[PDB]
Amino acid sequence: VNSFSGYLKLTDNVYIKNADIVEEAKKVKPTVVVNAANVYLKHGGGVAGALNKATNNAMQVESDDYIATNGPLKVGGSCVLSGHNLAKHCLHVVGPNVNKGEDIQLLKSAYENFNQHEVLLAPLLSAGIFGADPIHSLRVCVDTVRTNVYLAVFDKNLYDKLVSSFLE
Numbered sequence: 001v002n003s004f005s006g007y008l009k010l011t012d013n014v015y016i017k018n019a020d021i022v023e024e025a026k027k028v029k030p031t032v033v034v035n036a037a038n039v040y041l042k043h044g045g046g047v048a049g050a051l052n053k054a055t056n057n058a059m060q061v062e063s064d065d066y067i068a069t070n071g072p073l074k075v076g077g078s079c080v081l082s083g084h085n086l087a088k089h090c091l092h093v094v095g096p097n098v099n100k101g102e103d104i105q106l107l108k109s110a111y112e113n114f115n116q117h118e119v120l121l122a123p124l125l126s127a128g129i130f131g132a133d134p135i136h137s138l139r140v141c142v143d144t145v146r147t148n149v150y151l152a153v154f155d156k157n158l159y160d161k162l163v164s165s166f167l168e
């Protein structure tokens with residue numbers, strides 16, 4: 001477990017790689033994989049959809065049962081559930097969707113959830129269709145997370161732009 005390889009070291013506790021989070025979870029077998037979730041845990045597309053399809057829908061079925069009894073999460077909040085075949089646990093974290101008018105300040109709260117786990121495999125929160133500035137999301141991660149985080153960014157151009165910007 002936690003056999004991470006090929007990552008660029010940004011800080012003593014933040015690492016980054018141009019990779020698909022699904023393929024990283026299969027090779028690494030991490031203790032925790034982070035899902036970029038929405039408050040009702042509907043894993044239809046993007047990172048959430050990719051993780052769910054890689055569990056052959058077991059993640060969505062588990063999430064629907066959680067929602068039925070507990071209700072939706074809050075933006076900036078999180079929920080630990082099974083990681084199924086991809087990891088021991090899945091930490092479902094809700095980052096702000098700035099394309100839907102949600103507060104970017106809550107991105108700090110979203111990353112604070114990582115501090116409860118010694119090591120995690122994660123996507124860059126609120127990137128993609130959530131519309132947050134990816135350079136800013138990396139800065140919030142670096143300034144907030146104290147535990148070991150391995151960021152998988154599935155876009156070579158975005159990866160190159162983030163590394164170049166961080167090295168300034």
Ligand SMILES: CCNC(=O)c1cc2c(N[C@H](c3ccc4c(c3)S(=O)(=O)CCC4)C3CC3)ncnc2[nH]1
Nearest residue numbers: 020021036046047050123126127128129130154155
């Ligand atoms: C082939 C199956 N895998 C995938 O489709 C996949 C997609 C993917 C990925 N996408 C990034 C990303 C990061 C955060 C968020 C999104 C998307 S979202 O559009 O889902 C909205 C929620 C926040 C994207 C490059 C910035 N990052 C790592 N591993 C991946 N794997």
